[PDB]
Amino acid sequence: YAMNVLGNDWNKAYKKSARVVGDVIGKYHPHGDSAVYDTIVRMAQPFSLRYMLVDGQGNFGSIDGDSAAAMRYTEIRLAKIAHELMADLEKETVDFVD
Amino acid sequence: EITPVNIEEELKSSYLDYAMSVIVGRALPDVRDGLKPVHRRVLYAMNVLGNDWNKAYKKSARVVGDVIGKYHPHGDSAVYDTIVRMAQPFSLRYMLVDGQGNFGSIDGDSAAAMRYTEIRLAKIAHELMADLEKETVDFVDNYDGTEKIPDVMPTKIPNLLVNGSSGIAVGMATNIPPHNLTEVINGCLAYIDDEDISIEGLMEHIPGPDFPTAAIINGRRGIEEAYRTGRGKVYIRAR
Amino acid sequence: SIKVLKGLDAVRKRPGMYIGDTDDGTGLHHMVFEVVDNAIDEALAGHCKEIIVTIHADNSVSVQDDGRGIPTGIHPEEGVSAAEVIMTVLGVSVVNALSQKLELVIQREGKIHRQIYEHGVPQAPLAVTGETEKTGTMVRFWPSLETFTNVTEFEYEILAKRLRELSFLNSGVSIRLRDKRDGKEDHFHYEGGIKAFVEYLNKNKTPIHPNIFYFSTEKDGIGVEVALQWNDGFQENIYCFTNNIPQRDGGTHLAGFRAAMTRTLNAYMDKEGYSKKAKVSATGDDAREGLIAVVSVKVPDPKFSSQTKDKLVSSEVKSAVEQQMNELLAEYLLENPTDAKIVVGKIIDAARAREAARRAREMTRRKGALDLAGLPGKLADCQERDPALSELYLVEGDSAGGSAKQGRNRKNQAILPLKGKILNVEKARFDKMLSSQEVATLITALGCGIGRDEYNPDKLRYHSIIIMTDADVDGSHIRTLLLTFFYRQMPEIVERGHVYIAQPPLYKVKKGKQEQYIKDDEAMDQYQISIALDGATLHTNASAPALAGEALEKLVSEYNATQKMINRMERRYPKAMLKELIYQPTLTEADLSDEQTVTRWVNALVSELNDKEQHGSQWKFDVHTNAEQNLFEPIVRVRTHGVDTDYPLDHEFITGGEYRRICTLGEKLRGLLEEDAFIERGERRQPVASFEQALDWLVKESRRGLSIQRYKGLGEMNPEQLWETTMDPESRRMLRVTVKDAIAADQLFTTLMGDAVEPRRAFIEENALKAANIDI
Amino acid sequence: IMNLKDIIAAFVRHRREVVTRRTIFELRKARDRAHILEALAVALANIDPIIELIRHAPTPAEAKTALVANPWQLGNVAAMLERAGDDAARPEWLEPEFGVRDGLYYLTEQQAQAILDLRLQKLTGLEHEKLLDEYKELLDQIAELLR
Amino acid sequence: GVRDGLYYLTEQQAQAILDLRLQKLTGLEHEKLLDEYKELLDQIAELLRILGSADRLMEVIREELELVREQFGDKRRTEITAN
Amino acid sequence: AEVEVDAKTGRETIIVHEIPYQVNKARLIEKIAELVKEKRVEGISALRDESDKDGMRIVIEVKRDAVGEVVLNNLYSQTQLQVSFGINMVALHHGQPK
Ligand SMILES: COc1c(N2C[C@@H]3CCCN[C@@H]3C2)c(F)cc2c(=O)c(C(=O)O)cn(C3CC3)c12
Ligand SMILES: [Mg+2]
Ligand SMILES: [Mg+2]
């Protein structure tokens, strides 16, 4: 939802990971920021998800056991299939909470 | 293909690049507003976010993310450390940031991580950016050519004298002590009146520095020597 | 009636910018080349293949073809003959304008016609003058002897070489070339032109095998034709063409060809067991020792890196050529096993010759999964045991270190990451240097030993050390620190030439399917200039033909250089004042005593500056009289933001490099564009107010649908991109470090890296600060 | 390397430059507003011919072209235009042919476009009175800025 | 609304009338409204048809699922064998 | 995995093309090396990784006095070349687990 609000579409330029993590932590998720980055990283690895939901640019780890680079080095944007999970969101099809 | 190169030319070019970049864009303050580039970028980002002095606080992580994602292409821990220093009453004579939480103490304790704190602009920081939207300063490009940043601030406060500065560069350094605002204003008014006043005339209004932590200055010769030439030495003694 | 006359006059005003050079005579041959290309285009669909070229003794050339003749119809719009509209209307128009007399003959429908053109002005409408039975056209031209200078002649070889090349490329087409001054007749006709081209080139040398590999296919609209043969020489010569246009610097097709040949030859030599019989191995360079080959590609719309061609940058061409070459070359090695052996023998001889020139080595023990060998834990070693075939990389950070580990060739490449900034071994003591862990691990990984007591440079574990850092100002510092360490502690390693520096790219551009990598900012400016001049025409008036691409590129490059020079000197003169001097008459030194033209000149300059002004400022002029030889120097005063300043233009500025460069730029721009000034794209139209406005409009038009990405550091690149741009031996570029004087190097190192501060400050202040303000 | 007096002088010069640039910006903005205010004020006295002309136009572009074709009589707004002395409220990029020539006003394209965007609720009596107050205030501001 | 050939307005309709620009009085702006009104009537009829039937509801879902399968489907990677 | 035998000397090797889900390759190689250190399995002479851009490739060398099948079955039984996946489908329905 945060990436959708930021306007981080699948056919636009990439954005720094720190900006997205900062928005998520500062508006919606009241926890630490390192586990949020670890969660975001897993959604972009081709060997973890059958259909990836995040498109990444940089070093995101390997099947050999390597770790990803810190959040000051990478960039992300939404994947094309992730726009089908949020279709018709602005036509009052679901409920909202505080 | 492989092409040869002499070691002297490589050494000279690389070192001159590094030295000039550090001297002109990282470690020395401008004489008009008294800020380094990182301070200016932080203040501009906070102003763009709409983080005013009479509204709610915002988390530090959001501000750091904006700053390093749009204006400043470096690490985030050093940016947070820079933001922390601008809010401590025992570091700045007139604070520029308003803080909520654990920001350290004079006893030597460290501040909390940026997942715990909140900040907003101070009331005097709105006088450093007055009339910013009426085309009073020039704008330059960022590292991508997508955003624009002010070249200098249109300040109403003589910030360099009233807050001081300290930085280390290649081949040179700086060290300036803080002062008192009323005395500096009186000196500026006297200069406007006279325009030919001497150093002795200006010391009728500005007797010396004024540190945030009080204490005692022991002697008067170094003050006059520094105000007359630019280099001097003073002694600070506890009470 | 009159528009054509005005257009021809406009062309005559600046002939060079429409034809090219008029001093060496390149345009003189270019007119003939245009005529021959148009004729062969007509002869491309002709019933037969015959073209007549004649070099007459009266400084004229007549060319006759045998295709369908040019129609002699009537034009519904202009109401005149269709042939005349074909000839002179808004590249034969340039030739006719540059030729005093042009003979037009049309032979069709069994009738003979004839017409004469005088300086592009027809004398009579086309009329029937005889009867015939054949179809074709004939043109003879008499070039102008006043516009064309210093040559006024034709050379047989210049046309002969091009005609032979065209005949080789155009299979089944015959060309006859003759000269009437001395008397010659040359006929070119070949069926297998590409194969015949290889045979003709491989003539003076000694081929080692009679069979010549050759094929020709076409897939996805790309036509590929390859032919090659091995001589006994020691040099390689590859000739590339695209749509019958040569490229001296190659491109994607050449890269695909080289990769396919290397892979095929290596695989074949490995399978057959030849490489095991003799304890050697062959590289790409060994295969291409003595070789002659020709590559020609057919592409609908090629894209080039500049208006002067010489480099193809289309993407899919590489894949197509590589696939076609790799598919078929394998079969040839089986169909002709006798000739295959000779080439393998020559390659093995070359490889053995390479080996004998190396140093002496001892096998080293690498670090593996079953043994650690007492080596640092952060090192990622390789599998090769011969130190003369291994490489070591020193990378700046952890992220780039991981990226390099993921995308390397683990057979013979090792990685060692550096963390943080390294110690300065010029300001520290020996024991402090020994107790530092980064330096200790580096010394252990190198394996030579340190201390001038056990330092043996003959036990180096790798024979290539490569430094890879970011392309910012914090990588230059680390490069200097590493160079200081290597020079102060291990001089022999630098002396023998074991140290290299890597060159990663900085930009990446993409527009749809086309993508490319850009080295640095100069390449970016060149790419921006080139990409804005495609599919666009600039006409001085509404009835003039478009200019040449090369002239436009030269003008824009010179403008850019002059703009850079102007920007450099901004600290002493206002920037708007300097830009205005381009469009002003030159103030010669002879005018510095009249005291009457000076005032008019400065008044005109100030009036023009005050006329065009958007910000709040004012201009004024004044004249100062000097006693020395009664000089009179202009004075210009401005008022900006409430401050008044004066800029005296003294005698020194009049005679200087800046003013002369500005004048030289201005001479080509004063009165170039007329009032009409229309620019036409493929389907749209646009008026032009000034050269700068047209350039800005073109730039804005070209940037639509364009994506540009800038790399902050090495950690922002995918491992595949990093490998294919920086670490692949086939397509990487590096630098080798050498020492020139060895007596000034010590002084420079002591000054820049020593403890004393004052020499360093003085050096910085003298070099960077003052010398830049005055680059005279 | 500087002393006290240099720092004070630099601060004063910076302040002077900032104030000058701010004044220029505000003056330009005020003149731009006054132009459109004049254009709107003139067209509320010829309302019937304006409406008749607009109704017969088939396309807004044709209406815009027909608007700047002939001069319009000033009517009851000549007094407040005469109160403006010379060209104190005239933009510096305006050609000499436009504006008042001889008791007849000449419009430009932007003024016609602004006329075409007028809402129907501004034809009331009360909404008409604000133009004079705003015009007088703008004239006073322009004089003070020019001082 | 229309009751006996005489239209009765509300407050918001009057407010919309008061906010009408002068450029809307040209020729084309008087037929833009007619075209938009006809399109709105057609759309309203089509929307009302869905809410009254269940088969019409299921047809839309079938079409959407088939489109998704056409646009995002691919091949199988893992192989399943007997013991 | 597969077994290939040389046509000249009769020597044979084991080639691995794919590995199970959620398995680390470097740790797998390290475990195999450690296991063969203490003579837990017989028939292993050399072990190295030759993966490249074409795909994964792990080479295991068969000793001269053994058959590949026994070694391959021992590797299946003792290493992570065969794993178990316990299926347990629990999700939230109307705010309750089920
Ligand atoms: C691992 O590098 C760092 C060290 N070390 C380097 C030393 C030598 C190698 C073995 N580790 C030690 C500790 C350190 F002590 C502090 C920082 C640090 O504060 C920092 C930052 O962004 O704030 C970033 N870095 C890295 C970007 C350089 C730090
Ligand atoms: Mg953790
Ligand atoms: Mg740190």
Ligand SMILES: [Mg+2]
């Ligand atoms: Mg960096």
